[PDB]
Amino acid sequence: WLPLEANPEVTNQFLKQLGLHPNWQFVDVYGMDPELLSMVPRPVCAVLLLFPITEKYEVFRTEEEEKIKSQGQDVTSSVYFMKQTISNACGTIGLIHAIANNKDKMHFESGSTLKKFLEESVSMSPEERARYLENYDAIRVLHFIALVHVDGHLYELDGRKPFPINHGETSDETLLEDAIEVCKKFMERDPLRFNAIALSAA
Ligand SMILES: Cc1c(O)c(C)c2c(c1O)C(=O)C[C@@H](c1ccc(O)cc1)O2
Numbered sequence: 286w287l288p289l290e291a292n293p294e295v296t297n298q299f300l301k302q303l304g305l306h307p308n309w310q311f312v313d314v315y316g317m318d319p320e321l322l323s324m325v326p327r328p329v330c331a332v333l334l335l336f337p338i339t340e341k342y343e344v345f346r347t348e349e350e351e352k353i354k355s356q357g358q359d360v361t362s363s364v365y366f367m368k369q370t371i372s373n374a375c376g377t378i379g380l381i382h383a384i385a386n387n388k389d390k391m392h393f394e395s396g397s398t399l400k401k402f403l404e405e406s407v408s409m410s411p412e413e414r415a416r417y418l419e420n421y422d423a424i425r426v427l428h429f430i431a432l433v434h435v436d437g438h439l440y441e442l443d444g445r446k447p448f449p450i451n452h453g454e455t456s457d458e459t460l461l462e463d464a465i466e467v468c469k470k471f472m473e474r475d476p477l478r479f480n481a482i483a484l485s486a487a
Pocket of ligand 1: 334335336337341342343345346430468471472474475478479480
């Protein structure tokens with residue numbers, strides 16, 4: 286599985302292995318301050334956020350799950366969501382969430398293994414996607430989540446949760462800034478360090 290660190294060079298090597306043309310490359314997001322965001326090449330189509338699992342995460346996510354089940358949320362049918370059943374798989378799952386939800390922006394090489402995996406898993410349930418990932422030997426190389434734009438909304442994709450989380454309106458053009466605002470919200474949940482990479486045009 287992808288190592289549990291925010292490392293663009295390793296993640297881009299993985300993208301190449303998986304058969305993606307390198308006109309999208311991960312970059313570091315050096316921090317949330319606007320002059321740091323300006324160093325991220327645009328467009329951006331995904332942000333991966335790395336953070337440690339804490340007791341606060343477990344308590345908050347339980348509250349959030351109850352809230353969403355009670356109020357409902359909009360998760361459009363186009364969102365690709367894969368459950369996590371193996372801890373150390375969260376980096377690889379993050380990468381899959383980033384590519385699956387941006388498939389039409391991507392250029393896949395002929396025998397691309399990730400292209401194959403995506404075509405075969407587009408109609409699977411999140412649970413089936415987890416099982417297939419476990420089976421799929423060609424995908425072989427403290428928590429990661431993905432932030433993407435789908436159909437006008439900003440989705441958080443965390444395979445430890447039961448579903449995507451809708452964080453409000455966004456667009457392809459404003460995804461980086463809107464994702465960073467969601468990261469600021471996340472960090473308010475715990476009285477840490479910011480560690481993120483962005484999938485950027487190259
Ligand atoms: C339920 C829930 C989450 O879903 C997420 C993403 C969280 C938290 C949480 O409770 C936190 O409490 C800490 C947090 C975090 C994010 C960025 C960072 O640099 C350091 C910490 O992220």
